[PDB]
Amino acid sequence: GPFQGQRQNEFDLMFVKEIFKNHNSNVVLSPFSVKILLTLIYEASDTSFGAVSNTKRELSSVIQNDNIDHTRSYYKQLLESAQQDNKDYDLNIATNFFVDDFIEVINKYQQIANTHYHAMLEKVSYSNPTQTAATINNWVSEHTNGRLREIVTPDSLEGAVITLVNVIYFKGLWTYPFPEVANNVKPFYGTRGKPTNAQYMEQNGQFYYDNSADLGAQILRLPYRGNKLAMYFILPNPDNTVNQVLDRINSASLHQALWYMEENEVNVTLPKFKFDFSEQLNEPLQQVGIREIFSQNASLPLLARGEVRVSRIFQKAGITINELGSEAYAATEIDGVQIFNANRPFIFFIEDETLGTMLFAGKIENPVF
């Protein structure tokens, strides 16, 4: 069943809103993974001792009671709950610092990064951007089972000394798969311009659902097999846009909107989509107040043997939904109805329902499959 606790998603929702407001395209990212990146940077900073600085201060809403033992066990527990090896789904979060030749990585830091944050550090030579780009891109492929093939070009490494890269990959099956229909194209009414077309899937089922008066949107939950993950969809009522619904969403208002959902008979129509989304996170992080780590006053003394700072942060994520699930092509197993018909733009997210973790967040402006 749905998560009954309070999600620690204040930062997640803030950062998601910043990304969405600046891209007029489909978007998908992993807000939880962004917090992992920020916490690794926190761990690398001198500031992080229970000592003060604008770095320690700004990385705040991501750190746990500014107590490092708690921070490690917290993020470690959430990473392991999400990525738990199991027969039902495959989820992998991968994170690497790619560090220039001349930098000496502190061993105790590689230890903490691997153990608590399931992150690693590798040496490269930025004096050879071409070789380095190849190294980073092959790492992306290897850690996403080829779902993602590249994330940087030589040009995006220009001037870099440390690049922090995160990717995420997820394969899963719907608990309730859609019937497969060969031909089901219909119009899709995008936010701007004339309608486009999409390929749709439709079923009747019992799902947690509500038409939220507060948000001005319908909300729907489709669970994946494994008793852990579910995808939520927030579909603005026709009177409202994704941007208007976004402005209404915050931790408390999303808490209540999900709280109001209950199991209903629902006829669900969703457009199929497959896409990926890559971004350098420097600019959006700066926009939401995380600035000191990109400043001339930044340092990483607990990562790099002594001043260097993170040059660029990249994140990439791919997402697919079809009748069977996400990256799914086989399924060993197959009047008061409410109607949820997503033929206009909507928001979605995938959550660990045992802990509240916002593992994926995205929006569909033009679904292409």
- Distant-in-sequence, close-in-space partners of 319: CB < 8 Å, separation ≥ 6: 28, 170, 273, 274, 275, 276, 326, 360, 362
- The backbone torsions φ and ψ at residue 160, rounded to the nearest 5 degrees and listed phi first, read -80, 150
CA pair distance 262, 350, nearest whole angstrom: 18
Residue listed under structure tokens 């500031």: 47
- Local structure of 79: helix, strand or coil: helix
Alpha-carbon span 342 to 47, nearest angstrom: 47
Contact 219, 233 (CB under 8 A): yes
Of 323, 357, 351, nearest to 205 by C-alpha is 323
- Are the C-beta atoms of residues 184 and 201 closer than 8 Å to each other? yes
Residues near 254 by beta carbon (within 8 Å), at least 6 away in sequence: 7, 9, 13, 215
Residue whose tokens read 């027969």: 87
The helix (run of H) or strand (run of E) holding residue 98 is strand 90-100
Q: CA torsion sign, 237 to 241 to 244 to 248?
A: positive
Extract the tokens encoding 89: 């789904």
How many Å apart are CA 202 and CA 222, to the nearest integer?
13
- Integer-rounded Cα Rg, in Å, for the chain is 21
How many angstroms separate the CA atoms of 136 and 149, rounded? 10
CA 157 – CA 129 distance, rounded (Å)? 6
How many other CB atoms sit within 10 Å of the CB of residue 90?
A: 15
Distance in angstroms (rounded) separating the CA atoms of residues 362 and 353:
18
Nearest to 171 by CA among 316, 322, 28, 314: 322
Place of tokens 């915050």: 250
Contact assessment for residue 265 and residue 337, using Cβ atoms and an 8 Å cutoff: yes
Is the distance from CB of 147 to CB of 155 less than 8 angstroms? no
Measured from the Cβ of residue 5, the count of other Cβ atoms closer than 10 Å reads 10
Q: How was this structure determined?
A: X-ray
Residues 6 or more apart in contact with residue 128 via CB below 8 angstroms: none
The DSSP result for 241-285, as a single string, is -HHHHHHH--HHHHHHHHHT-EEEEEEEEEE-EEEEEEEESHHHH
Q: Same fold for the domain at 1-30+173-272+322-369 and the one at 31-172+273-321?
A: no
- Let me know: does 83 contact 91? Beta carbons within 8 Å: yes
**Terminal C-alpha separation, the chain:** 30
| Residue 42 and residue 64 in contact, taking contact as beta carbons nearer than 8 Å | no
Q: CA 40, CA 286: separation in Å to the nearest integer? A: 17
- Long-range CB pairs of 55-58 (<8 Å, 24+ gap) are 55/292, 55/293, 55/298, 57/292, 58/289, 58/290, 58/291, 58/292, 58/293
Please provide the CATH number assigned to the domain covering 31-172+273-321: 3.30.497.10
For residue 304, give the DSSP letter. Answer: B
Residue 31 token pair: 């807000």
Q: Would you give the DSSP letter of residue 302?
A: T
CB atoms within 10 A of CB 142: 10
Q: b or e along 203-214 (b: 16 or more beta carbons within 10 Å of the residue's beta carbon)?
A: bebebbbbbbee
Residues 6+ apart with CB under 8 A from 136: 96, 98, 124, 151, 152, 157, 163, 165
**CATH no. for 1-30+173-272+322-369:** 2.30.39.10
Mention every residue, 6+ apart, whose C-beta is less than 8 A from residue 267.
202, 203, 204, 337, 338, 339, 340, 341
Q: What is the Cα–Cα distance from 141 to 149, expressed in whole angstroms?
A: 5
Tokens for 207? 């799902």
Question: Residue 92, by phi and psi: left (phi above 0), alpha (psi -120 to 50) or beta?
Answer: beta
Q: What are the φ/ψ torsions at residue 226 (nearest 5 degrees)?
A: 125, -5
- Cβ atoms 95, 120 nearer than 8 A: yes
- Residue 93: strand, helix, or coil: strand
Amino acid at 74: Y
* DSSP element (H, E) containing 44: helix 31-44
User: Contact, 295 vs 57, CB < 8 A?
Assistant: no
Residue type, 212: S
Domain map (residue ranges) of the chain? 1-30+173-272+322-369, 31-172+273-321
DSSP code, position 192: S
What is the C-alpha separation between 224 and 234, in angstroms, rounded?
A: 17
What's the token pair of residue 100?
Answer: 């220039």
CA distances from 266 to 176, 187, 208, 217, 337 (A): 12, 21, 9, 15, 5
Burial of 43 (0-12, 13-18, 19+ CB in 10 A): buried
Q: Cα–Cα distances in Å, from 288 out to 31, 39, 281, 320? A: 13, 16, 11, 28
